[PDB]
Symmetry: C3
Subunit: 192 residues, 3 copies
């Protein structure tokens, strides 16, 4: 049960836009309990042509905000991911809510809405986008927020993924199925 994910290759379960009437992408998130820290693995695959065109320009920004409750269960209504996470006990969602907080980011490490302590609970790094026709690689800046702020009375934990493109003439086409490359990461996990 040391794993909590989206599933290997899942169906469209994102909402890359503050409008979209449905799911436009395909987030693949794999969290694994490693004692003190949690092991991250993140990768996005745009499903909606609207999201598949964003890159067509020269600069873009996609961010997905995830919110959990006090027991580490995804809150579909609040968070951009609209499909619950499950812990691989098959490849199918495992039952027995034995607490998923084990995968939750320590609020003592990653404090909520605090000043005189300014953010300093960010994850920064680079992932890459492989060009449609040409197989080139454009570096897109990725950063994980971690307990951004609780927008809801029922938000106890938060993990936010933000990809930022800012190059000179991205793939001008659409075959740009937009595929962010895997971004490996870790964060101090919540106590028990």
């Amino acid at each position: 049960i040391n794993t909590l994910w989206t599933g290997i290759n899942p169906p469209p379960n994102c909402q890359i836009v503050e409008n979209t009437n449905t799911n436009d992408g395909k987030l693949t998130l794999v969290l694994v309990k490693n004692g003190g820290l949690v092991n991250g693995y993140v990768s996005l695959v745009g499903v909606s042509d609207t999201v598949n065109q964003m890159f067509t320009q020269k600069t873009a920004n996609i961010q997905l905000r995830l919110y959990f409750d006090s027991s580490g269960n995804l809150l579909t209504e609040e968070s951009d991911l609209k499909i619950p996470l499950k812990n691989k006990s098959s490849t199918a969602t495992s039952e027995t809510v034995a607490s998923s907080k084990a995968f939750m980011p320590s609020t003592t490490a990653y404090p909520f809405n605090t000043t005189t302590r300014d953010s300093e609970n960010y994850i920064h790094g680079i992932c890459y986008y492989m060009t449609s026709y040409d197989r080139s690689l454009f570096p897109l800046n990725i950063s994980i927020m971690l307990n951004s702020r609780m927008i809801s009375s029922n938000v106890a934990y938060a993990i936010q993924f933000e990809w930022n493109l800012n190059a000179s003439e991205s793939p001008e086409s659409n075959i740009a199925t937009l595929t962010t490359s895997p971004f490996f990461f870790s964060y101090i996990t919540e106590d028990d």
Copy 2:
């Protein structure tokens, strides 16, 4: 047994130049089963005058292709690595064949030779090389394929590393035994 590796400080076990009939590099590969993911650790060291006199050029491309059978076993023949991977249980491999599939990259999140899913199963990142005389750092792109294509009937999985340099004037002498800094990756292990 969470560990499948090349062993600590192995002996020449690669075939880097697509020409050599002898091993010209020492590859260190360590895979550790961690829930639904597999923690990777690669580093490479040059052995032959040939390989070592590569960063003497402002441009290089070394690539190692590994192929395993349905039982997570390495195909020495089809691979550039000519020594089977072993599981930590001493510092010496452990016997029995409970199957090394648990370390094999899931052929569901990373499919084989087909279109409509054109690549997107690549892990791109950056590792470094630290000059001989001086102590300066050179960025050298790394990218891990993952089930490129079954170059043989008896191929179940494949993992291909690829170190590429592209700067302007690198340690041009020779002592350059060549050394990639370790690069850390993670992918979705095979079901079981």
Copy 3:
């Protein structure tokens, strides 16, 4: 017991400057036993006024040198880290000197003071420093040396961290609580 650390959020446990009568930074370090590997986590925070004003220039290089005795305990004398690394069996240390070795960097994969092997035991990568007023990032260079050399007869293993700024005009203020973003690393653990 697979978690050796400083503890989520610690007290200035450092000694960056080769001067400071006392500590001046808050190093956050998490090691995790993981098969033949050790998954690391690193983030440093500036406490002193002197430190929090380094990034008021264009360059800087700070290095926390670490050393352990044959059983894997942090030798506070020789290190710039002045508080032993406790085991996580609460959020407060764990007893039973059943050995912390398993967390230590294999003296074989990473040898000590020697030639014919010069250096070749560094981990290089980039983490980031966010701007105080602007929400920008300035990439710094962190190298992890592993088993540098043994400066004392009681030195068994060592893990040296080095961060390096080398850009052009950094957050010239002081608000610079000097918070380096987390740096994920892995190294091959000592036999047992």
